[PDB]
Write a protein that binds this ligand. Structure first.
Ligand SMILES: CS(=N)(=N)C[C@@H](Cc1ccccc1)C(=O)O
Ligand SMILES: [Zn+2]
Length: 307
């Protein structure tokens, strides 16, 4: 509340809280974290990215977004945890410090602020954005299906009322477009990670095509290692593979797009529980999830700095 050491990482928070948390963090470690606004949500809410850097001009960076799907609260929770973790581990953890000394980290905790606010105010299970209009009384698009990666292909719905509505056109959603422009403009992103929320999977590109990525051998081993690392804390078991192969076909996905942009280390993480609690994960599981997930993330980051 008053400082980042007082903030309760063991509970779920509102939009305001996370935003306030953002400012505390920047106030406390001004030389390491900066708060950037890459856009405004459909309902005009600021879209913020927290930039962790030790200097340099335009260093190779790591992209990390959480809460694209509003109801997946564990991700926003894990998001805030990571942010504090970055400030804590710099200069203490030999490996993490090595990473920050050479690369920057872009962390977007609340990728979909409108839906997030909605999950607090009216429907806890809301997952889409809150954009309106058309020949429909239904609101929102599935932000993870609005990307220009086999956009509109099988694995997404053209029906606005649908939970997996892809939107009118690729990048129609500001929350999405804001990232695209940011990342395209930066031009030196090396890794791109998108965090979900439930089923315990480590996925790597192509949800939209059966086509195998050229870097499949390498991506597969990294995922193997990441999953191995993650399970070392509490023995949480994750499955890994390509999207289409492990789950099902999905078009307009975040990770397919990033990979197509030449960002090789494109992985999607699906926390935490395999259905017992689902999207309504007990707050008591926040830390543990954050802790383990971090191990898998750092694994991937280490690979990145090394290749
Ligand atoms: C449980 S869920 N809705 N997070 C599953 C998440 C699986 C996915 C990962 C990457 C890319 C496209 C699809 C989705 O359907 O968006
Ligand atoms: Zn999701």
């Amino acid at each position: 509340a008053r400082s980042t050491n007082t903030f309760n990482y063991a509970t779920y928070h509102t939009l305001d809280e996370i935003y306030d948390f953002m400012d505390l963090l920047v106030a406390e470690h001004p030389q390491l974290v900066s708060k950037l606004q890459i856009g405004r949500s459909y309902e005009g809410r600021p879209i913020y990215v927290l930039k962790f850097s030790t200097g340099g001009s335009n260093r190779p960076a790591i992209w990390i977004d959480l809460g694209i799907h509003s109801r997946e609260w564990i991700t926003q929770a894990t998001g805030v945890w990571f942010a504090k973790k970055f400030t804590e581990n710099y200069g203490q953890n030999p490996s993490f410090t090595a990473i920050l000394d050479s690369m920057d980290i872009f962390l977007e905790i609340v990728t979909n602020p409108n839906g997030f606010a909605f999950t607090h105010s009216e429907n806890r299970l809301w997952r889409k954005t809150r954009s309106v209009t058309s020949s429909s009384l239904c609101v929102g698009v599935d932000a993870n299906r609005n990307w220009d990666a086999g956009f509109g292909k099988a694995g997404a719905s053209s029906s606005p009322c649908s939970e997996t509505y892809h939107g009118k056109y690729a990048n129609s959603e500001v929350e999405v477009k804001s990232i695209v422009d940011f990342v395209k403009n930066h031009g030196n992103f090396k890794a791109f990670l998108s965090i979900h929320s439930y089923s315990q999977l480590l996925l790597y590109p192509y949800g939209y095509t059966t086509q195998s990525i050229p870097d499949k051998t390498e991506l597969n081993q990294v995922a193997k290692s990441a999953v191995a690392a993650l399970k070392s804390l509490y023995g949480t078991s994750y499955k890994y593979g390509s999207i289409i192969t492990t789950i099902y076909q999905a078009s307009g996905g975040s990770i397919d797009w990033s990979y197509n942009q030449g960002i090789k280390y494109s992985f999607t993480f699906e926390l935490r529980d395999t259905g017992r609690y689902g999207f309504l994960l007990p707050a008591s599981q926040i830390i543990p999830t954050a802790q383990e997930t971090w191990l898998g993330v750092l694994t991937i980051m280490e690979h990145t700095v090394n290749n």
